[PDB]
Symmetry: C2
Subunit: 605 residues, 2 copies
C-alpha cells in the first residue's frame, strides 16, 4: 500500500526509511530546484533575445547543466523534463562539465555557452594542479535552449597564461562593459570574460580576457585585473570574510540606484575558498559568498580596486552565486514594468558541500536548492549621523556626501532584495497581522495567530532605544515552534549580528546523523539616523521567508542570511515575539502572509 | 594443403589471390619494416644512455608507434613482437597518435617522448584547420622502450601561438645546439623543439621552441625561425623541389666532415607537401624529401637562412625522414669505431601515400618500408673546375675555397651514404666482378655472370668523354631482366639526371591495378674536375642496392633515389650494360655482391 509517514508521531533514524519516502518532507514550493536529485552551482542564465524568456541553469547530479525558463520571473518551466542540456563525455570534457555562461546573441545569433570543460580530476586549490585539467570550450543551442551542442573543435581557451601555476582556472563569466571599452580602446560592446581562481604561493585572482575576433574563437589576455595576497582580507575580516585561498564563480556587472546600468558602478560577486591553518588536503572549510564594489583604472594594464565589500548571503551553505543582466525588454520585465536588472541566484548546498555525513539523502531523493532570485542595485542610506559607526573603513559601505549643518552623511552600499515579481507572488497568499508591542522583560510571547503551515513570509520592524547600543540585548522571533521544536532568529547588538539559533529546530537531528544544528550568523550595522531632528538607532526592517525547510532572512534591503530549518512535527508552525530582557524593544505591527505560491505549476511534485 | 605460387608461371590478377599469399613475394630482408602490416613515418629514435642500444620507431597500421632496437646498426630486434609502444585512445589523443621524438635522458632519467596527440580529423593544409586538432604531449618509458606511458595530464603544448591560423602543427623534433644556446643566451644544453607546418595564406614554416623548465612542462616560443612564402622554391625549382604548401617532419642537426658535431654547420631535413593548381581538396600530389643547409643569425629573433638545398631522396614515394644523433659511445659505434653520427631513415611509402588504388594489399599483408639507415655529413668535392657548372647558385652545393693558379674550387654539399655497418653487412654475401669495357653503339650487353637472386649490391664507375656534356647520351645498367621483364637505371646528360625506367619492370602491372610503372628521376651534376693536370667530366660512382622489390640508387656519396621494383618472374635476375649509342662510355670493373643479409635474425619471416 504505502510506507506510512505521520508527522505527529516521533521520527525514526531517517536513514532507515525507504528510498524516496522523505521526498516532500522538507521540499520547498517557491524555489528553483530540479524535479529531483542534486543541484549544484547555478550558471548558464540568459535572456533569449528572440522570445524574451529568461533561462536559468544549474549543475545537476554532478553530470552537466540543467535548465528552466520563466516568462514572469516568478514561476518556471523545466527544459527536457529536467534532464541536462549539456553533459560530460566529449573530447574536451571527458571527465566533467563545470560552470559556464552564455552570450545570448552569439554564433549564428544563437545562445553561445562558454564553459569549463574538465579532463582530469582531482582539482583543488590545496594540491598541485594537473596541467590541462580545466579548459574553456564553446557550445551553441539551436533548439531554444534545451540542448547546447558542443562545437566540434578543441577548447577556445586551452589553459592559463604561459607557465602560470594556477590553483584553479574555471567558471568563465561573459559580460559587456563600456567603461572597460573606453579604458582598453576595445571595440564597442566587446565581450569580456573573467575566469576565476588564483596562483599558488601568490593568492586568489580573476583573470580577465576580451574577445579578439567576432567568432569568439580567440580570447586576448588582459591580466589579473583583480588579485589579492593568499588569505588576505577586506579590512580586518569583520565585514567581508576573507579573500582566502581561491576565488570561484566570479560575476562582473555594473549598477545604478534602479538596477543594471552599463555605465554604472562596477561590482563583482565571488565565492572564496577558506581554510584554517594548517590546510587539510582537498578540504575547503569556509565557503564565503561575497560582493565587492570597486573602481577600475588603467596603468598599462587594467585594475579593479575594491572600495567596499560584504556578503551576498551570510549562510554557511550559501555559495556560488550566478547572476545575469535581465533587460527591461524581457517578458518578465515587460509585465512588471521593471528597468534593466541584474538578477542573482545564490546556491544553498543541501549537504554542507558534501561534508554532511549520514544525511538521509536516498530518503529525500533531492539535495540543495537555489535561493530566491535577488535584484542587485546601488542602495543609498540617507540622514545617517556622521559618527564613528558611519565612518568605519574596510566595511560594507562608503560615505558619498555629507551635510555639516545637519551633522549627517549619505551612505552607499549594495542593495539586495527579492526580485519584485517573486516577492509579489510570495505574498499572494492570505495575509493577517499581529499587533505591535513593546517588550522589556525576558521571554517568548506567543502570537495571537500563527500560520498553520510551514510556508510563509513574516515582516516586521524592530526599534531599539539608544541604550541598546553595545549592550547584551537579543530580540527577534521564535518560529516553527511546538513543544518539541523551535527556531529563533534574533538581532544581537553585542556583535551587531543577526543570528539563527538552530539548536532546537529539528527533532530529526536527535535521531539521525548529518542534520546540521549549528548557529548561523551575519553582521548587520544599524547606524544612528536623524529624522524630524531626532537622532535614533535605525529601524530593523526584517523579512523572513520560510519555504518548508528553506529559511531566507532579509534586512533593510542590504542583508541576506539563508539556511536549512528542517523541522519534523506537523505542529511546529507557531510564532512568538522573543526578547532576552536586556533593555527594551518595540515591535511594529507584524505581517504574516501564508501559503507562498507554486514556482513549478507544470510539475505535480 | 596450400595455395600454390610458381614464379615461373604467369601472374593472375593478384587481387584474386588469398589473403597473405604474397607475403614473401616482394619482401625485403635487409630493411627496417614491421613483422607485417603497414609502416608509416619513422620517428621516436633514440640511443638509450644506460645500454648504448639504438632504438628505432615508426608509425604502424595507423594506430601508434612501434619500435625495435639494434646493437650494431645492421640488424634489429622487435620490441613487443612489433606491437605499438604507444597507441591512440587517451584523453589527449583520442583520435590518433602522430609523430614524436625522444629526449633520451629526460624525466626521471627516462626516455621522454614528445609527440603530436590528435583529437580531431581531418587535418590537411588545403582545408580549414580545426582548432585543437593537434597538441603536443609527453610520455615516458620506464621499461626499456617497450611502452611509452602517457603522462597523466594535458598536452604540454596545447596549440600554436595565439590566433595563428596554421596549416599544420605537428611532428615535434627535440634537439640540442650550442650555436642556438649562444645566440639566445639559453642555458647550456637546453633542449629545443621544432614543430612543422605553416600558416594559411602565408606559407610553410618551422615553429621553434626551447624548454622553459627542467621538467619539460613549458616550452617558450622563439618564433618562426624558418618560413617561406606559399609554394616558393629554392633557386628556380631545379635542384630542391619546392617549399610548397606545408612543411612536415622537420629534423634539425649539425654536421662536420666526419658526422654529427654540436658546433658544426646546421642542416634541416623536411617533407614538403606540393600540389598543382588548382588545389584538389585534401590531396597532396607531390611529396618532396628535402635537405637544407643554412646559417643562423639573430636580429631580435633567431633565423635560419638557407644557403643550399637538395633531396635526401629523389624517390616519388620517399618521404618523412626521421634521423637522430648516434653517439660514438653507442653499442654500434663502439664496435665499428665510428665518431658521433647523424643517422637518418627515410620512409618509402608502399602505396603512393594511399593513392595506389587496387594494389593487392590483403595478399601482400604488408605495406611500406624504411630505407637503409644513412649517415649524413658535410661532403667536400675538391679540384672542381671553376666554370659556370660549379658556380651556379640556388643549387645543392656551394664554393668554400678557390685556387686561381689551378683554376679550381672546393665545393661543399651534404654527404649521403649507407651507414657503415649496414653497408658492410650488405656486402657480406658472395662477391664477383664483371670486366670493365667501353661502349659506343646502341644496345644492351649481357653480363657474363648475373646474380641468381633478387638480393644484391652492384657498384661501378662510369667515365664520360668531354662530348657527353649537353648531349643525348644515356648509359647505365639493365637489371632484374628476363624475356618478360626488365628495369633500366641510367645517367642522362640532357637534364643531368639519374632515371629508373620501370615501364617493363613488372609483369604483374599488366594484370593488376595499383602497381605503379612511372619513371623515377633525380638530378645529379657531374662537374668538370682536374687531376694530374687533365680536365675531365667527374666519374659517376654508382651503387645499386636491390632488396627484392626495394631499389636504392646511390651516387658519389651525395645522391639517393629509391623506388619499388616489383618484378614477378623467378628468372628476372639478369644484369646488362646499357648505352644508347650517343657518344661513348667507359665502365670500370663492376662488382656484384649477392645475398645481402638478414636484418631481422630473430624473426622467421
Ligand atoms: Na557561505
Ligand atoms: Na618523395
Amino acid at each position: 500500500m504505502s510506507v506510512v509517514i505521520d508527522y505527529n508521531v516521533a521520527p525514526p533514524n531517517l536513514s532507515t526509511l525507504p528510498n524516496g519516502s522523505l521526498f516532500e518532507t522538507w521540499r520547498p514550493r517557491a524555489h528553483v530546484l530540479p524535479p529531483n536529485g542534486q543541484i549544484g552551482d547555478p550558471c548558464l542564465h540568459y535572456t533569449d533575445p528572440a522570445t524574451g524568456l529568461f533561462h536559468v541553469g544549474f549543475l545537476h547530479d554532478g553530470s552537466g547543466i540543467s535548465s528552466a525558463t520563466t516568462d514572469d520571473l516568478a514561476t518556471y518551466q523545466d527544459l527536457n523534463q529536467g534532464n541536462q542540456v549539456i553533459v560530460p563525455g566529449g573530447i574536451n570534457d571527458p571527465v566533467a562539465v563545470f560552470d559556464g555562461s552564455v552570450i545570448p546573441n552569439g554564433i549564428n545569433g544563437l545562445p553561445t555557452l562558454l564553459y569549463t570543460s574538465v579532463s582530469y580530476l582531482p582539482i583543488h586549490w590545496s594540491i598541485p594542479y594537473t596541467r590541462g585539467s580545466e579548459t574553456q570550450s564553446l557550445a551553441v543551442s539551436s533548439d531554444g535552449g534545451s540542448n547546447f551542442t558542443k562545437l566540434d573543435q578543441g577548447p577556445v581557451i586551452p589553459g592559463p597564461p604561459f607557465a602560470y601555476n594556477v590553483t584553479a582556472f574555471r567558471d568563465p563569466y561573459v559580460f559587456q562593459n563600456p567603461t572597460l571599452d573606453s579604458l582598453l580602446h576595445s571595440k564597442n560592446n566587446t565581450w569580456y570574460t573573467v575566469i576565476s581562481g588564483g596562483l599558488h604561493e601568490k593568492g586568489p585572482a580573476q583573470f580577465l580576457y576580451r574577445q579578439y575576433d567576432s567568432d569568439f574563437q580567440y580570447w586576448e589576455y588582459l591580466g589579473q585585473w583583480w588579485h589579492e595576497p593568499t588569505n588576505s582580507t577586506w579590512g580586518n575580516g569583520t565585514w567581508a570574510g576573507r579573500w582566502a585561498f581561491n576565488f570561484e564563480t566570479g560575476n562582473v556587472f555594473s549598477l545604478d540606484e534602479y538596477g543594471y546600468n552599463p555605465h554604472g558602478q562596477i561590482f563583482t560577486t565571488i565565492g572564496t575558498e577558506g581554510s584554517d591553518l594548517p590546510v587539510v588536503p582537498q578540504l575547503t572549510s569556509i565557503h564565503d559568498m561575497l560582493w565587492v564594489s570597486g573602481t577600475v583604472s588603467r596603468n598599462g594594464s587594467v585594475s579593479f580596486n575594491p572600495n567596499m565589500a560584504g556578503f551576498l548571503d551570510w549562510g554557511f551553505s550559501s555559495y556560488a552565486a550566478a547572476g545575469k543582466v535581465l533587460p527591461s525588454t524581457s517578458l518578465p520585465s515587460t509585465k512588471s514594468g521593471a528597468p534593466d536588472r541584474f538578477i542573482s541566484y545564490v546556491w544553498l548546498s543541501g549537504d554542507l558541500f558534501e561534508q554532511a555525513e549520514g544525511f538521509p539523502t536516498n530518503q529525500q531523493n533531492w539535495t540543495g536548492t537555489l535561493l530566491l532570485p535577488r535584484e542587485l542595485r546601488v542602495l543609498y542610506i540617507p540622514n545617517v549621523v556622521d559618527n564613528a559607526l558611519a565612518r568605519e573603513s574596510g566595511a560594507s559601505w562608503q560615505v558619498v556626501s555629507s551635510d555639516g549643518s545637519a551633522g549627517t552623511v549619505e551612505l552607499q552600499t549594495l542593495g539586495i532584495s527579492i526580485a519584485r515579481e517573486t516577492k509579489a507572488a510570495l505574498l499572494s497568499g492570505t495575509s493577517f497581522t499581529e499587533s505591535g508591542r513593546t517588550l522589556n522583560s525576558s521571554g517568548v510571547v506567543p502570537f495571537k495567530r500563527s500560520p498553520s503551515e510551514k510556508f510563509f513570509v513574516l515582516s516586521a520592524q524592530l526599534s531599539f532605544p539608544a541604550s541598546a547600543r553595545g549592550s547584551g540585548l537579543k530580540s527577534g522571533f521564535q518560529i516553527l515552534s511546538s513543544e518539541h521544536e523551535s527556531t529563533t532568529v534574533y538581532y544581537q547588538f553585542s556583535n551587531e549580528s543577526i543570528i539563527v539559533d538552530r539548536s532546537n529546530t529539528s527533532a530529526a537531528a536527535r535521531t539521525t546523523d548529518g542534520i546540521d544544528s549549528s548557529a548561523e550568523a551575519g553582521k548587520l550595522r544599524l547606524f544612528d539616523v536623524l529624522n524630524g531632528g531626532e537622532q535614533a538607532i535605525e529601524t530593523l526592517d526584517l523579512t523572513l521567508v520560510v519555504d518548508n525547510s528553506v529559511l531566507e532572512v532579509y534586512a533593510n534591503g542590504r542583508f541576506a542570511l539563508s539556511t536549512w530549518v528542517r523541522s519534523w512535527y506537523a505542529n511546529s508552525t507557531n510564532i512568538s515575539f522573543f526578547h532576552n530582557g536586556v533593555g527594551g524593544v518595540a515591535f511594529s505591527k507584524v505581517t504574516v502572509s501564508e501559503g507562498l505560491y507554486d514556482a513549478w505549476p507544470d510539475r505535480q511534485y
